[PDB]
Amino acid sequence: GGGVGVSTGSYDNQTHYKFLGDGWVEITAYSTRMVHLNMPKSENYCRVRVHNTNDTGTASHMAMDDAHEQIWTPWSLVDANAWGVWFQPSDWQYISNNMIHINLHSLDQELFNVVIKTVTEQNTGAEAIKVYNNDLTAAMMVALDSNNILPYTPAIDNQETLGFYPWKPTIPSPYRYYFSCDRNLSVTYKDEAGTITDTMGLASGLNSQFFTIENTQRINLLRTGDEYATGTYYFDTEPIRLTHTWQTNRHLGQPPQITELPSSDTANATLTARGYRSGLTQIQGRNDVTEATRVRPAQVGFCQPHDNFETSRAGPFKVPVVPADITQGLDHDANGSLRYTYDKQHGQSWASQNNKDRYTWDAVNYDSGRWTNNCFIQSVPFTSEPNANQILTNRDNLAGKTDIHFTNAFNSYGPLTAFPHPAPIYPQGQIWDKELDLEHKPRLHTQAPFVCKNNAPGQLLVRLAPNLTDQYDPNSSNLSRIVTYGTFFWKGKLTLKAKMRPNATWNPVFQISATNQGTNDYMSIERWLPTATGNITNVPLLSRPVARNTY
């Protein structure tokens, strides 16, 4: 039934595993959080712009332009989409070690045990004590967008998603969305003489969309005895593979046949002379077959233009880059490794004195990466031993500039390209993402493993209904209202399908394992353990431990 003094829900954060048959596992993850909600700092939708001239007013700073236009709303969203919400670290280990692939199934959400209190300040003076007491008749406004009418706004982008710690309360993210505005920002280099345009445009009758929660949604009013339940949402998605691929474009197919087995363990085997070797190559005019020049089924990974900034009406932005292995040469940006910035709630440690903590994720697929300094292009007709003019190296100055090299602007993507789909990032990463409404769609989104084919799971929006004092003028500019805050429990259930991996290999596979403290190894256990004062940290776990045969 429900009422004052009766709990409307239950607190379940534990995770379960059912084995449904051969190799098939149904993973059910319950997660629950206490959520703290403040009266919004304004009652009005607001259209605001940030234009930072201090940064962009002077040359070469283009990359730091923040200028944009957004709609600020009194509403706040509860966003459950990150991996760190749903699983505790060991669960991620257990899944990552034993399962070949995994897929989303369904999502449920509930809100219950709403509590709303009002603040009053008694004994005015040096003491200035605050008094807290329940308003039983106050309500909380709740809205879910099933039809995805509102702009879709993943909270993890800013790391505003619900915290990762079951026993720590968490806060919603205030809901906001971009608004169409035009920006002109000229391109300059350091200490260049000239003037920078650095302007923003007036509103566009064509492009302007202003949405209002109240007009687009059905809002449920929740008092204390009330509870809200989302229906069961079902994902339509492709499963993702949990095993990394080691197998490079030069490891494909049949190896050459050795002449004879080596005599000692230190010796190296020998091959038929490249002049006499049989095989298939696309090089013209030479009689040779070499492991490097032999034809392969397809291109694995591809060179990408990196630190590419392109400018449409909105301004400059960096082109995304498909995450790939940073090779032995370690260069991150060419292969587009991800770099996260996050706070204590999602990570870091309460021991840390820094405002944020930062981590750089490297792709775990050791095949498709590109090591640029060793890439080169050779002139035609092909020749052995090219001279300086017959080969283009990564040391070659492009357009007469020192630090720019063709690998910056070179794009090898083509019909023969094949690359692995990047991997989820356990504590911090976006589980699912909505697909763009464009006709021609990208092969994959960069940050999120899962993309909803038809309709994304809805966004859950909340605000406190305003409490008004005795004196209210509808025409007044300033609004006096009772100081009020509230708390409620958020609960959700996330079902996943996964399948155990086979092992055909003789040798032991690599695994995710804890390690003794006292060595600096990344897996040293204390990082997963509480401190004396209760400080705890949650750090990215490597994913896809087990190798797989690509071909």
Ligand X SMILES: CC(=O)N[C@@H]1[C@@H](O)[C@H](O[C@@H]2O[C@H](CO)[C@H](O)[C@H](O[C@]3(C(=O)O)C[C@H](O)[C@@H](NC(C)=O)[C@H]([C@H](O)[C@H](O)CO)O3)[C@H]2O)[C@@H](CO)O[C@H]1O
Binding site as annotated, residues for Mg(2+) = 147
Contact between 146 and 464 (Cβ < 8 Å): no
Which listed option, a copy of itself, ligand X, none, makes contact with residue 331 (CB within 5 to 8 Å by class)? a copy of itself
DSSP 160: -
Which listed option, ligand X, a copy of itself, none, makes contact with residue 547 (CB within 5 to 8 Å by class)? a copy of itself
Q: Check residue 194 for interaction with a copy of itself (CB under 8 A).
A: no
> Does a cis peptide bond (omega within 30 degrees of 0) precede residue 381?
yes
Q: Give the rounded distance of the alpha carbon of 259 from its chain centre.
A: 50
- Compute the distance between CA of residue 485 and CA of residue 489 in angstroms, rounded to an integer: 14
Q: Check residue 453 for interaction with ligand X (CB under 6 A).
A: no
Which listed option, ligand X, a copy of itself, none, makes contact with residue 359 (CB within 5 to 8 Å by class)? ligand X
Which listed option, ligand X, a copy of itself, none, makes contact with residue 382 (CB within 5 to 8 Å by class)? a copy of itself
Largest CA distance in the chain: 99
Which one of residues 111, 321, 431, 496 is an interface residue with a copy of itself (CB under 8 A)? Answer: 321
Which listed option, ligand X, a copy of itself, none, makes contact with residue 194 (CB within 5 to 8 Å by class)? none
DSSP 412: -
Q: Check residue 436 for interaction with a copy of itself (CB under 8 A).
A: yes
- Per-residue string for binding with a copy of itself, 37-76, x by CB under 8 A? -x--xxxxxxxxxxxx--x---xxxxxxxxxx-xxx-x--
Q: Check residue 360 for interaction with ligand X (CB under 6 A).
A: yes
- Compute the distance between CA of residue 175 and CA of residue 41 in angstroms, rounded to an integer: 13
Give 129 or 232: the residue with its C-beta nearer to a copy of itself. 129
State how far the alpha carbon of 176 is from the alpha carbons of 71, 83, 173, 215, 397, in Å.
6, 23, 9, 16, 45
90: tokens are 């060991």
Q: How far is the CB of 430 from ligand X (least distance, A)?
A: 18
The one segment of 103-111, 254-262, 357-365, 467-475 that binds ligand X by CB under 6 A: 357-365
- Compute the distance between CA of residue 272 and CA of residue 256 in angstroms, rounded to an integer: 8
Q: Check residue 453 for interaction with a copy of itself (CB under 8 A).
A: no
- Coil, strand, or helix at residue 60? coil
Give 121 or 521: the residue with its C-beta nearer to ligand X. 521
Q: Check residue 229 for interaction with a copy of itself (CB under 8 A).
A: no
Q: How far is the CB of 453 from a copy of itself (least distance, A)?
A: 15
Which one of residues 18, 358, 421, 481 is an interface residue with ligand X (CB under 6 A)? Answer: 358
Q: Check residue 535 for interaction with ligand X (CB under 6 A).
A: no
Alpha helices in 69-176 (DSSP H): 83-86, 89-98
The one segment of 103-111, 181-189, 229-237 that binds a copy of itself by CB under 8 A: 181-189
- Coil, strand, or helix at residue 398? helix
Strand ranges, E, within 57-209:
68-78, 99-121, 130-134, 140-145, 173-178, 183-184, 199-200
Binding to ligand X (CB under 6 A) within 233-252 occurs at: none
Q: Which amino acid is at 299?
A: Q
Total residues contacting a copy of itself (rule CB under 8 A)?
A: 360
Which listed option, a copy of itself, ligand X, none, makes contact with residue 293 (CB within 5 to 8 Å by class)? a copy of itself
Alpha helices in 150-242 (DSSP H): 213-216
Q: Give the rounded distance of the alpha carbon of 356 from its chain centre.
A: 17
Matching residue, tokens 């004062």: 533
Q: How far is the CB of 516 from ligand X (least distance, A)?
A: 18
**How do beta strands 432-434 and 99-121 pair?**
unpaired
- Per-residue string for binding with a copy of itself, 342-371, x by CB under 8 A? xxxx----xx---xx-x-x-----xxxxxx
| Binding interface with ligand X (CB under 6 A) | 357-360, 539
